[PDB]
Design a protein around this nucleic acid. Sequence first.
DNA 1: CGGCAATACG
DNA 2: CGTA
DNA 3: GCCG
Length: 331
Amino acid sequence: WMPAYACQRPTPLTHHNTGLSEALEILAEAAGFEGSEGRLLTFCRAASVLKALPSPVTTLSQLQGLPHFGEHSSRVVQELLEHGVCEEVERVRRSERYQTMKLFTQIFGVGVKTADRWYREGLRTLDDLREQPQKLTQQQKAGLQHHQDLSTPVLRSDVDALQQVVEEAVGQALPGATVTLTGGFRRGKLQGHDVDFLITHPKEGQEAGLLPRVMCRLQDQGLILYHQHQHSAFERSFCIFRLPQPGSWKAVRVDLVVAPVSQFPFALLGWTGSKLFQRELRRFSRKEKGLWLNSHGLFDPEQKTFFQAASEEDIFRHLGLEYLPPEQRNA
DNA sequence: CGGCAATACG
DNA sequence: CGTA
DNA sequence: GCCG
Ligand SMILES: [Mg+2]
Ligand code: NA
């Protein structure tokens, strides 16, 4: 069988329906470009269902009984099985609207609304945006200047170098503080487009005011190309690191998050992803268990109490779910 | 229809 | 609006 | 788009 929520099933990084899931995610992405979050979500879910399957889908009948597969998603798979291509998907791929929206939304500091506005104004290329720099935010300027690097896959080797750099600065800012690699790379990805770190300290309260000290020490080593700090919500910094390369360097998006150790398991769970996994997990928590989950804790609205967690295993237990290791959360 | 994760901070 |  |  196949449970309805992605958090109820192991989803490996690599699977047996790559072509089909990729096609459905094109439509998901396109739906988001047109402001259709509901449709995006369904296409994302349907694609994730195929990721969780134990073998390739070869016939349309194998879609029977599968959640989030209705008339539209089944037709897409049906055409792919029969012709090798889905005309709607190909029509989307080739369209100027999709290509331009995809180009713009990949820019750091540019979301759908902004990308949509720029498109309606007649803008189509990166150079179009560069010709009118006066109307760009500092965040967008940085994303535009470093677009080529940020669009280049980050390798696991790169991540390890970045971690030792972060751990060095963190170690000086607060002795005893720890750094944990999260996000996609914790889920076993061999390459990605950004890096996420979670920072904490074994003694509750000592992690307070840590990130400004960390950022200052990183800035002193000339490693920060862009910095956006958010105060404690955990204290967070969305950065662009200068990562040393053979004879040169490249820009990499790095997120630093500091959480008190008491909330660390919730922060780790939220920041490990995947994005769809977390959305599904929180949807499951609220609608099936009547509990409110976020990156900070798990709230029982009936008893008005927060669940204490010492580990991710605790959280899955609280929600009555079988534990899933990070590399099985690739929904 | 009513919902679709989360929600503070820049 | 954007970041997550 | 799909679910209830
Ligand atoms: Mg990130
Ligand atoms: Na982005």
